[PDB]
Structures are given as structure tokens and as C-alpha cells.
Design a protein around this ligand. Structure first.
Ligand SMILES: *[C@@H]1O[C@H](CO)[C@@H](O[C@@H]2O[C@H](CO)[C@@H](O)[C@H](O)[C@H]2NC(C)=O)[C@H](O)[C@H]1NC(C)=O
Ligand SMILES: *[C@@H]1O[C@H](CO)[C@@H](O)[C@H](O)[C@H]1NC(C)=O
Lengths: 44, 49
């Protein structure tokens, strides 16, 4: 059920954030000023 | 007039740190609430080449 992590300061597009999404051992990684789902999850 | 520097900061950068924040704040420490004015100098400033 655990499928990654968010890292940064404010975590809400006010700053650059490292996003890691995990598919057990495959990983997706990107570093934008993302706006996620505001109460975060992988959006299945 | 485009070529730009943050003229002031609230701390020095870590080596190879990138910072694209854009907020007015201050040069110094006067209460300013994100509005320009005395001491409230926006650090993003540029050169007339
Ligand atoms: C990295 O980010 C942190 C915030 O998450 C910055 O820490 C704050 O720095 C100001 C002064 O610049 C202090 O007034 C705050 O009390 C600090 N907060 C915390 C929680 O420590 C920090 O300046 C940033 N580091 C760099 C090198 O830019
Ligand atoms: C991992 O999951 C993402 C969606 O969360 C998907 O785009 C990607 O193709 C997946 N990769 C693998 C190898 O499972």
C-alpha cells in the first residue's frame, strides 16, 4: 500500500519538492513545484 | 533589463542549492507583510545592460 514519498519544505507548490513514487522496486522520480492531491496519496 | 540576482537572502545557499522563490519580504528585517517600501526591498533585482 506504501507507494513512495514527498520531500521539501512547504510541500504545496510554494517550493520545489522531490516526489518519489514506488512500484515495489520500480521508481518514478521528479522534482517540480507540484500541486498534488492536497491530502496526499497515489491517485488510483 | 532582464538579467537578475537575488540581492539579499535570509540565509546563504548550500553549495549547488537552487532557489526560485519570488517574494518581496525585505533586504533587512522590518515588518513588511509582502509589500514593498523602506527596508521592504524585494531582493529580486536586475542589471540594465
Ligand atoms: C532551508 O529551509 C529552512 C526552512 O524549512 C530554512 O530555515 C529557516 O531559516 C530562517 C532564517 O533564514 C529562520 O528564521 C527559521 O527559523 C528557519 N526554520 C527552521 C525550521 O530552521 C533555511 O534557511 C533553508 N536553508 C538554506 C541554506 O537556505
Ligand atoms: C509505476 O506506476 C506509475 C503510476 O503510479 C505508472 O505510470 C508507471 O508506468 C509504473 N511503472 C511500472 C514499471 O510499474
Amino acid at each position: 500500500i506504501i507507494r513512495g514519498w514527498i520531500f521539501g519544505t512547504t510541500l504545496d507548490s510554494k517550493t520545489q519538492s522531490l516526489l518519489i513514487v514506488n512500484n515495489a522496486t520500480n521508481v518514478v522520480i521528479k522534482v517540480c513545484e507540484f500541486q498534488f492531491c492536497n491530502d496526499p496519496f497515489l491517485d488510483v | 533589463y532582464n538579467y537578475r540576482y537575488r540581492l539579499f537572502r535570509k540565509s546563504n545557499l548550500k553549495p549547488f542549492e537552487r532557489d526560485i522563490s519570488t517574494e518581496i519580504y525585505q533586504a533587512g528585517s522590518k515588518p513588511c507583510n509582502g509589500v514593498e517600501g523602506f527596508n521592504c526591498y524585494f531582493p529580486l533585482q536586475s542589471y540594465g545592460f
